[PDB]
Amino acid sequence: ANAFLPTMPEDTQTGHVLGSPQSSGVAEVSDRGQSPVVFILTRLLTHLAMLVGATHNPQALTVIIKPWVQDPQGFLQQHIQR
Amino acid sequence: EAELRLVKFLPEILALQRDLVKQFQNVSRVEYSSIRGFIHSHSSDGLRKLLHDRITIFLSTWNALRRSLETNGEIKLPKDYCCSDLDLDAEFEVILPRRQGLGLCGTALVSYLISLHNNMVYTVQKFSNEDNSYSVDISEVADLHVISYEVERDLNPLILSNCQYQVQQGGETSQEFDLEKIQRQISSRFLQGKPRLT
Amino acid sequence: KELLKGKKQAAVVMLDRIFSVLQPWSDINLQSFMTQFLQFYSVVQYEEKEVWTNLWEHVKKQMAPFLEGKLTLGLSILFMVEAAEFTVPKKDLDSLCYLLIPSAGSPEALHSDLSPVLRIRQRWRIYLTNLCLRCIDERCDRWLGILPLLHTCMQKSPPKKNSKSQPEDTWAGLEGISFSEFRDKAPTRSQPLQFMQSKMALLRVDEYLFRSWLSVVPLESLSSYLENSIDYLSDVPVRVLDCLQGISYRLPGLRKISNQNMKKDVENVFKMLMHLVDIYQHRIFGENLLQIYLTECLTLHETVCNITANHQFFEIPALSAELICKLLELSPPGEKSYEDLVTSTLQEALATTRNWLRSLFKSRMLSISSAYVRLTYSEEMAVWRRLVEIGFPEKHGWKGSLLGDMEGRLKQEPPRLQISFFCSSQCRDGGLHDSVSRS
Amino acid sequence: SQFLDTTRLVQSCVQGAVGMLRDQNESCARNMRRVTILLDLLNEDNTRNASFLRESKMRLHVLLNKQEENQVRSLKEWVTREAANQDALQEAGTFRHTLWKRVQDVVTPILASMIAHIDRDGNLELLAQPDSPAWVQDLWMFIYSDIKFLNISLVSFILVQSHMNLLKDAYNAVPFSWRIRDYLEELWVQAQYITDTEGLSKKFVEIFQKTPLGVFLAQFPVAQQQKLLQSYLKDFLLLTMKVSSREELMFLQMALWSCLRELQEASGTPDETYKFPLSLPWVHLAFQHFRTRLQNFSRILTIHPQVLSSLSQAAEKHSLAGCEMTLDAFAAMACAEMLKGDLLKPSPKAWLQLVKNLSTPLELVCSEGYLCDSGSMTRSVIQEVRALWNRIFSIALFVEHVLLGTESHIPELSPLVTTYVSLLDKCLEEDSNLKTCRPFVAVMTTL
Amino acid sequence: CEALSIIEITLGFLSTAGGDPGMDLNVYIEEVLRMCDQTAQVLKAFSRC
């Protein structure tokens, strides 16, 4: 419940503050102190364990993941595809 | 790399901001709601399409870069700015370059491009050159002052020109990146001979 | 003559050749025809009438497929006769203008689909304006249907208040036409009102045409224009703001009112405007348009008090104060911005009425001169009864103020002659608490 | 009318109008200067100042008339609104002084905004000079006497912004630099959208000759037109590129004059738009045809400032700026001769920074994409610039590869390789073309 | 009130420009910024400043 989740950007800003995966944005360069390969691998393992927890009780992933209100499954499928 | 791909579009958005400063040097008087209503409020059709091209460039750069600004920019800006994809029917005050409220979009974007460019030239100018005094202002930035290239025409053939193939007598194929030749090629075409922006 | 017959045959086959390329419909094709006709005119006993003889012989032919069973013919013949500077007959103004009238083009999306044909916004403007001024001679009936063409290839409608934008040519959107000798003449040509009765559907194709038709109609046929266009205002209850702007543009251009005819005409126009206000609702006042209506009715009051100077013409400011009464008594209460707004507009309106009353009463009252004491402005008590009887809200003034004005006007008279006039059968009609009689 | 002494009113409001203005807080603070200027030229003695009074009163008439249509007519009745204002009456004493203070406080921000629109960069002093010819004051009192060509919108401490980032007291020589520049660039965008890029110069000069500024400048005779043309050259270079000198600006003015004459020498003989070669809009055509070929030259004068001194002999020994845009080639030649004169004299390290900073512009000039077309002499000069830069750049690889290496690691080999620098220099002055056999064999044997 | 208007104008001038710190205020008022005669009373007041 509102924990500083791993591999998120930082200026705190808890949660899963990331946009739609069909974004025209930059390639998500690694943050404050980390190599890019460890960053994208840790992001991938993180999104896999949040999705495993998201298949059980999606209301807790609505109260964790910030912008949507509709569904967790397709959003994270697009993220795992990317 | 993906942010220096878009420094080519910086004199265009500075042409935008100079024309808006030159046109709208007022306060609480601009009565335009949305950008599309202002763009159709011009009679000379070439200037309409010119503003359309520059605003399409500005919206594409903004939709690209709107995630590093709130975590790496020095100007702390809120989250009601970059939580949507901007379009031609959005609000009009996002292009007038103010410094406190909702006009931090244009100013924060130009200042962050200047800060990225000046951080990388500072890294170059600390490693090997050790001194230079070449520094130009932001009043005469033409196209030839910013780091500009393309990836599918200008970056990929230089890097592809330095993958070296080595075959031993036993029979192998080792790919080696001789980093000195790629450094000398990348340095003496793009990122040497450039100013330190103020 | 035999070479000229071959010249005519070459002309008819080249005109057929450039009519054959007109079947694909794009601007890229249309750019080529101006290049083809310029080179055709460059290479051509050859008088200048023989060039126009071949052009006039074809143009009579394609009315027969097109009058019954078609915009590209009129733009093509405009390119062909602008391309030579050639006088047309008056009787051919009956046909060529009908080639431009956008029948079966009633959606505006089809006009935006026809827009990429005519993308350059500058050459055609001079072309349409010279054609308008060329056909402005006394046949002049069909040229009102060319206006929907020249109102779709430029900027949208400016919604601002009057005397801010510019005078009438920018609001209406003509900018090259001297209509002012034509609304003010001997109107022997009333065929525009029949043409506008017949061709009503063109009001669906844009927003400029109702405004430009308002600035072309004569005064005695303007009330008929508002009665024939009730249902278009039922479709959109915003164009009465355009009616207010058109009358506030049209009134001060007229000078002082001197006849009974203009009295009948302006009274008829004000009864139809009050009628079209009070039929529908305060849905006219929607989405915070009320302030602009208030500024327009104050400007309209100011421009109608400045053109009445005979005091038997009190019916017209009487109408213009019952109109602001009706628009005030319909609006919704929201806060105190509306309350300060209604107080300020009512104060300025009563200030305008009082400054009108001080403008034409530049002498005394009840000068005797005959031992048969009579008013010098003989129909005066009707003016005071009429301008006092409109019911403003009485938390404001209008009754503590104008009656005090009348009291200050009455004590300027000596008491003997005043009392002799008060029972002289010209202070008649004690009207059951008629408040000027209590005064 | 005689209802109010308007001249006394304007002269009273000048000081309070000018004292609210501020510049960018060091950019030639001229408040007392503007007071002296306006009070010298708001009189009725000269017909210059009389016509300026009549036109300033006409601009005040139309700007207050557009300003007071927004009023609700209870503030238009200003005498009655001010007599009901008790505090302003008892603050100004009598009634007529109170009314005059009211008209002064109305006119004063309008005059201040008017000075903020006129005095953009120094346009007033062109009236304050003596011995200025008829084109200066005639063009100044043509542009200021037109409402539609020169809009003045209105709005406290109002900001007037500088455009020329100028030196001490510039006073731009054309009477309005910025309005003609923005008008001609609007005309440029409309001209290059209407027609194609073949009759662009013809349509651009003809659409210039249509405008009222064009038919105003045509009745000037030839000499004032030419003086206006060199003045507009100098101010256009000060407007576009910030240049930190006086004599760099003279060489750029000859260079853009060479560009304009070159572009007028491009077409053979139409002689109908070359019945006006001495006209304003050619400047913009020259810049829009040659912008990189000027800007690179600006960069080759901004990184290396001393080479301009060498250019201070060059036009005295070549007599350039007559036929073709040639100053880039002599600046390239003078810069390569400066680097070939010394090779070691400040230090080897500072010589490497100076040659690596000028590597990019000097390599850009010797490319066939930059020099699209010119005469054969400019192409011949670029081949010698190519050869001399190939020699200097090969020396730069040799220095940065062996000399700083043996100055960093093993300081026991420098008096040998510093001799072999001169040995490679003596073997290479004859043939500077490494694409053939003999200098390649010579460099291998020397190594 | 007249004196306060005069000195708000002159402080608006003295703020965004330079000033000689001597030079008694009348010889600033009538000749430098060329101000006319408002009233003699405020000038007899400002004579010793």
β-bridge partners, B165: B175
Quick one: tokens of D248?
């760099």
Shortest CB distance from D73 goes to which of C122, C164, C348?
C348
**Chains C/E: 3 or more C-beta pairs closer than 8 A?**
no
Mutation to test the B interface, candidates D297, D360, D367, most B Cβ within 10 Å: D360
Q: How far is C164 from chain D (nearest CA, A)?
A: 7
Q: Which residues of A2-27 are buried (b: 16+ CB within 10 A; e: fewer)?
A: eeeeebbbeeeeebbbbeeeeeebbe
Quick one: which of C93, C92, C112 has its CA closest to C102?
C112
CB contact under 8 A, D357 and B193: yes
Chain B residues near any Cβ of chain C (below 8 Å): 40-43, 45
Per residue, the 3-state secondary structure of C304-354, as one string, reads HHCCCCCCCCCHHHHHHHHHHHHHHCCCCCCCCHHHHHHHHHHHHHHHHHH
DSSP B68: T
Quick one: tokens of E49?
């400043």
Residues of chain D found within 8 Å of residue E1, distances taken between Cβ atoms: 91-92
DSSP B154: I
Q: How far is C118 from chain B (nearest CA, A)?
A: 13
Residues of chain B found within 8 Å of residue A25, distances taken between Cβ atoms: 63-67
B positions 2-41 inside 8 Å of A (CB): 2-3
Quick one: tokens of D146?
């037109």
Tell me the three state secondary structure of residue B34: strand
Tell me the three state secondary structure of residue D122: coil
CB contact under 8 A, A27 and B68: no
Alpha carbons C292 and C241: distance in angstroms, whole number:
8
Give the Cα-Cα-Cα angle D160, D236, B190 (nearest 5 degrees): 100
Q: Which residues of E4-41 are buried (b: 16+ CB within 10 A; e: fewer)?
A: ebbeebbebbeeeeeeeeeeeeeebbeeebbbeeeeee
Tell me the three state secondary structure of residue D124: coil
Residues of chain E found within 8 Å of residue D87, distances taken between Cβ atoms: none
CB contact under 8 A, D36 and E34: yes
Residues of chain D found within 8 Å of residue E36, distances taken between Cβ atoms: 11-12
Alpha carbons D330 and D310: distance in angstroms, whole number:
10
Q: Are C296 and C241 in contact (CB under 8 A)?
A: yes
User: Residue B165 is inside which H or E element, if any?
Assistant: strand B163-166
D432 touches chain E (CB under 8 A): no
Looking at residue C256, its amino acid is K
Alpha carbons B10 and B110: distance in angstroms, whole number:
7
The stretches of D43-93 forming alpha helices (DSSP H) are 47-67, 78-83, 86-92
Q: Are D208 and D280 in contact (CB under 8 A)?
A: yes
Shortest CB distance from A11 goes to which of B64, B71, B83?
B71
B180 touches chain D (CB under 8 A): no
User: Residue D187 is inside which H or E element, if any?
Assistant: helix D177-194
Shortest CB distance from D74 goes to which of C164, C302, C347?
C347
Alpha carbons D120 and D172: distance in angstroms, whole number:
10
Cα nearest neighbour of D40 on chain E = E34
Mutation to test the B interface, candidates C121, C175, C291, C292, most B Cβ within 10 Å: C121
CB contact under 8 A, C164 and D70: yes
D positions 70-99 inside 8 Å of E (CB): 91-92
Q: Are D321 and D314 in contact (CB under 8 A)?
A: no
Residues of chain E found within 8 Å of residue D21, distances taken between Cβ atoms: 16
CB contact under 8 A, A25 and B70: no
Largest CA distance in chain E: 28
Query: Cα-Cα-Cα-Cα dihedral of C178, C179, C185, C186, to 10°?
Result: 120
Alpha carbons D207 and D187: distance in angstroms, whole number:
8
Give the Cα-Cα-Cα angle D45, D48, D50 (nearest 5 degrees): 55
Tell me the three state secondary structure of residue B83: coil
Quick one: tokens of D365?
């000039």
Query: Cα-Cα-Cα-Cα dihedral of D247, D253, D259, D263, to 10°?
Result: -170
What are the CA-CA distances from residue B32 to residues B35, B90, B94, C60, D186 (Å)? 8, 11, 12, 51, 22
Cα nearest neighbour of C158 on chain B = B41
Quick one: tokens of E13?
């001038």
A12 touches chain B (CB under 8 A): no
CB contact under 8 A, A26 and B60: no
- Chains touching D by CB (3 or more pairs below 8 Å): B, C, E
**Chains E/D: 3 or more C-beta pairs closer than 8 A?**
yes
Alpha carbons A75 and C216: distance in angstroms, whole number:
61
Q: Are C147 and C125 in contact (CB under 8 A)?
A: no
Sign of the Cα torsion E6, E8, E11, E17 reads negative
Cα nearest neighbour of B2 on chain A = A26
**Chains C/B: 3 or more C-beta pairs closer than 8 A?**
yes
Quick one: which of C306, C418, C428 has its CA closest to C366?
C418
Find tokens 């400032």 and name the residue: D305
β-bridge partners, B163: B177
**Residues whose CB is less than 8 angstroms from the CB of residue D84 and which lie 6 or more positions away in sequence, other chains included:** none
CB contact under 8 A, B45 and C120: yes
**Residues whose CB is less than 8 angstroms from the CB of residue E42 and which lie 6 or more positions away in sequence, other chains included:** E2, E3, E6
Alpha carbons D307 and D312: distance in angstroms, whole number:
9
CB contact under 8 A, B43 and C155: yes
Residues of chain C found within 8 Å of residue D191, distances taken between Cβ atoms: none
Cα nearest neighbour of D35 on chain E = E33
DSSP B134: -
| Phi then psi dihedrals of residue B177, to 5 deg | -95, 95
Quick one: tokens of D410?
């093993």
Per residue, the 3-state secondary structure of chain C, as one string, reads CHHHHHHHHHHHHHHHHHHHCCCCCCHHHHHHHHHHHHHHHHHCCCCHHHHHHHHHHHHCCCHHHHCCCCCHHHHHHHHHHHCCCCCCCHHHHHHHCCCCCCCCCCCHHHHHHHHHHHCCCCHHHHHHHHHHHHCCCCCCCHHHHCHHHHCCCCCCCCCCCCCCCCCHHHHHCCCCCCHHHCCCCCCCCCHHHHHHHHCHHHHHCCCHHHHHHHCCCCCCCHHHHHHCCHHHHHHCCCCHHHHHHHHHHHCCCCCCCCCHHHHHHHHHHHHHHHHHHHHCCHHHHCCCCHHHHHHHHHHHHHHHHCCCCCCCCCHHHHHHHHHHHHHHCCCCCCCCHHHHHHHHHHHHHHHHHHHHHHHHCCCCCCCCCCCCCCCCCCCCHHHHHHHHCCCCCCCCCCCCCHHHHHHHHHCCCCHHHHHHHHCCCCCCCCCCCCHHHHC
Find tokens 């062909």 and name the residue: C80
Quick one: which of D73, D96, D72, D70 has its CA closest to D83?
D96
User: Residue B39 is inside which H or E element, if any?
Assistant: helix B35-39
DSSP D403: I
Strands B174-177 and B163-166: antiparallel
β-bridge partners, D195: none
Q: Are C245 and C165 in contact (CB under 8 A)?
A: no
β-bridge partners, B166: B174
C positions 106-135 inside 8 Å of D (CB): 120, 122
**What is the resolution in angstroms?**
4.0
Q: Is C373 left (phi over 0), alpha (psi -120 to 50) or beta?
A: beta
CB contact under 8 A, B144 and D299: yes
What are the CA-CA distances from residue B163 to residues B186, C145, D264 (Å)? 14, 72, 50
Shortest CB distance from B65 goes to which of A19, A26, A28?
A26
Q: Are C376 and C365 in contact (CB under 8 A)?
A: yes
Alpha carbons C380 and C273: distance in angstroms, whole number:
27
User: Residue B174 is inside which H or E element, if any?
Assistant: strand B174-177
C54 touches chain D (CB under 8 A): no
D69 touches chain C (CB under 8 A): yes
Find tokens 């809200």 and name the residue: C393
β-bridge partners, D159: D22
